[PDB]
Amino acid sequence: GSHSMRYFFTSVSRPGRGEPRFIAVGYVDDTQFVRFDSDAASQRMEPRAPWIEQEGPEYWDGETRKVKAHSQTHRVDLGTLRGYYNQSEAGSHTVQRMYGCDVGSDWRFLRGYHQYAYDGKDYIALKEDLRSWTAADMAAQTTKHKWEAAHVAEQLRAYLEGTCVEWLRRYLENGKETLQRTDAPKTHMTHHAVSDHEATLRCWALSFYPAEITLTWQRDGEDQTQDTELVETRPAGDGTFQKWAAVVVPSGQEQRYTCHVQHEGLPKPLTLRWE
């Protein structure tokens, strides 16, 4: 199937409380594999998946060096952005950054990303062609002009179409057991008498990977989207995910309702029914 690799960076200024916080995390698909935390004791890029631990000292020393270079840029960015918007030194502000690449089912380059946000809003982003920039407001256009003159997009495109996908393939082959796996959802239903004339039917999906899934209810085959309580897909904490969908059915109508599960790990979609 298709695969992706993403790096997420968060930088939070701490007025009066010293250095800004800085957290970087790396993902392959829905699996985190590296992390760096400015407040933690090691001051190193650290493994978060077992299949990245076999990487040697050169990998860790180089990723540590580069992640520090990300941190230093974000430390400067907070001051720079504070000036662009004429904000005081007393308030805390947030910078976020994300970049990475998508590969299709042929494992060739499909899409590349580099996005930047200030205080929860889009600031500047690389366009799909990996050659131009989208700048949200007037301040962002000053950054856009700076990055155009310095040919920042030229270097990013080379990283996204080259290095990013090459190391994505390497991670996929090295962590084959973890990353090229699919865990089908384990499914069950619960039935709880809310009152004497209606009951809650809840369709569970457990222990699945990757996170993408479709959980829906039908009544006589008709979609119940507006009448279904759907929770956000949530991590189990062991690398799998969970989700459920519930519907309130009048007593004696349970046989009308079917729950439908679509997931990559299933040989074919599931139709469940309380009976």
Binding site: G26, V67, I124, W147, Q155
Partner: peptide
């Protein structure tokens, strides 16, 4: 792996 170049805004 991370990108090696990180331009400041």
């Amino acid at each position: 792996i991370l990108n090696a170049m990180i331009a400041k805004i």
